[PDB]
Every structure is written in structure tokens, then in C-alpha cells.
Amino acid sequence: SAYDTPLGITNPPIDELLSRASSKYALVIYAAKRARQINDYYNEYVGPLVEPGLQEKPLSIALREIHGDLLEHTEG
Amino acid sequence: LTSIHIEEHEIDARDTKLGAEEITRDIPNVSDEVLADLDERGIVRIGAEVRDGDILVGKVTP
Amino acid sequence: ENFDIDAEAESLREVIRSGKGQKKLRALKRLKVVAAFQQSGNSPMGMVLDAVPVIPPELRPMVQLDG
Amino acid sequence: IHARSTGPYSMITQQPLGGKAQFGGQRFGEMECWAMQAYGAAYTLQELLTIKSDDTVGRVKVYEAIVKGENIPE
């Protein structure tokens, strides 16, 4: 199961994210709320956890983080 | 395969009940740059290159 | 004003039971609208207007055109 | 070719006035909404049919929020 390397938005790969959260629909909010938090930190102020890029976006950071298993979620 | 494309832009000094409309160069709230292309009439001179936003006909409503 | 929804609704539930056939259908067509007004918090007094509402002006606009 | 981040809004209808000439936005129709629902991009549709079109407090706040670089208000 080799893809050489991902690039841009397709990094990180979705199948490795779907393992982490219950479903893509959860993963969306999972990433989104975290991203809204990361957005807020620059201005709930926790993060960024993983060492971010120089000019990197909160969505990329959030979607990177979920893949790393630095976060945990509760389904309402 | 280059084409010439000619577009028409109309405006009318219609009468209102407050005063009357007039096509004139002088506008209260502008700079010299945007009315440099205009002439004594208050319309852009023949051949002055216009950009999307630039004034063509200076008209004032009462 | 001179109306009692409960008695009317009740009677209609009997007149359907009494005359089974074509008139039961009419009494049952009559029943549904009456039966609804019982459980409804709003009174059927509001079916008539002493005052009529007026839509916000902007949704019926009078704007002068370029002329 | 059309483009519109923000500009003039129409007076009678509180969505962006449509047209190439009038510096207008594009029509996000029902068949577009069905595709969006069929994905289930709830927030996307709930952005498109609100702050990105109709909502007078949303259309003014979204620009400020984006240019300041804050969270997009609900």
C-alpha cells in the first residue's frame, strides 16, 4: 500500500485519517473546530501541537495533527 | 486572429424635481488623476485608454 | 364568540356514529377542521381581522429610476 | 470571465446583483444545493445560502473577519 508521497491538500492521506475519527463527517468537524481553535490561538487557546510550517494554514495543521494522534474527540 | 471589439456606453442628463442633471468635468469628490483623461465638456478625450473602473462621462445629480 | 368547540367536536363524533353511509363522510369532512381547533393553543377568534397587518415597505418598494 | 470577493449589493433583493457588467457574483442554484447536500457539506451550503448571499450582518462581518484573519462568524 505505497503512494510514494502526497502533495498539497491530499497530504495527509484520507484513509489514514478515516481510521482516527468515527467517519469523514466527524473528521470534518474534528479538523474544523481544531482549525478554528488554531485560528483563535494567533488572536480556547491550545496549539499548535505539531511543529507548523513557516507560512502554513490551520486546516493543514489540524489535518496533520489528527493523523499524528495528538487529539481526542467526543461524539454528542 | 486579433479582433477589434467596439462597445457603446450611453448616459442622459434627465430632468428631476429637485434641480437638473448636467454632463460637466468638475466633480466634488474625485482626484485630478481620474479627470486628467476628461476634457472641458466633461467626457474622456478620443483615444485615451480606459481601465475597468475609470470615469468616462462626468455627470452630477442635484 | 357564541361558540363551544368541545360540544361541537363531541356531537360530530356521535353524528358520524349515528348515520353511517354518505352523511357520515360529510360529518367526518366537517370533523377534522373542528377537532383541530381544540388542541390548537390559538383560538378560532383570530380567523376574522379587526386590524390587518402591513408588510415592510422595502418588500413593496417605490424607487425612482435613472430619469 | 467573472470574479467577486465583495462589492455592491442590490437594494430590493439582499443577494449580490447578477451580471458580468455590474461586477456581479454567480447563481448557486437548487441543483447545486442538491449536490452539496448529497455530499453533506452542511457548513458550506449554510455559508453559501447565508453570509455568502442573503445575510446583511454576515456579508459585512465575513469580509472584516477574513481581512482581520479571525474565525468566520456562525
- List the one residue out of D38, D37, B10 whose CA is nearest residue D48: D37
Please tell me whether the peptide bond between C61 and the residue prior to it is cis, using omega within 30 degrees of 0.
no
Residue pair A32/A62 in contact (Cβ under 8 Å)? The answer is: yes
The number of distinct structural domains making up chain A is: 1
With an 8 Å Cβ cutoff, the interface of chain C facing chain B consists of 66-67
C63 CB neighbours in chain D (<8 A) are: 11-12
Distance set, CA B12 to CA A64, B23, B35, B56, D51 (Å): 60, 8, 19, 13, 37
- Experimental method reported for this structure: cryo-EM
Q: Which domain holds residue A48?
A: 1-76
Which DSSP string corresponds to A17-42?
Answer: HHTTSSSHHHHHHHHHHHHHHHHHHH
CA distance C39 to chain D (A): 35
Backbone angles phi, psi at B38, to 5 degrees: -70, 160
A to B contact (≥3 Cβ pairs closer than 8 Å): no
When CB atoms are compared, the residue of D40, D43, D71 closest to A39 is D71
Give every CB contact of residue A38 below 8 A, 6+ residues apart in sequence. A47, A48, A58, A61, A62
- List the one residue out of A49, A42, A17, A52 whose CA is nearest residue A31: A17
CA distance between the termini of chain D: 31
C66 CB neighbours in chain B (<8 A) are: 12, 14
Cross-chain residue pair D69–A36, CB shorter than 8 Å = no
Please state, as a whole number, how many other Cβ atoms lie within 10 Å of the Cβ of residue D8. Answer: 11
C to D contact (≥3 Cβ pairs closer than 8 Å): yes
Cross-chain residue pair A39–D70, CB shorter than 8 Å = yes
- List the one residue out of A20, A7, A9, A5 whose CA is nearest residue A59: A9
Q: What is the resolution of this structure in A?
A: 3.8
Helix axes A24-42, A58-68, angle to 10 degrees: 120
Q: In which residue are the cell numbers 469628490 written?
A: B29
Q: State how far the Cα of C19 lies from the Cα of C28, in Å rounded to an integer.
A: 11
DSSP designation for D67: H
C67 CB neighbours in chain B (<8 A) are: 12, 14
C61 CB neighbours in chain D (<8 A) are: 11-12
DSSP designation for C51: S
Q: Which three cell numbers stand for residue C43?
A: 383560538
Q: Bin A47: left if φ > 0, else alpha if -120 < ψ < 50, else beta.
A: left
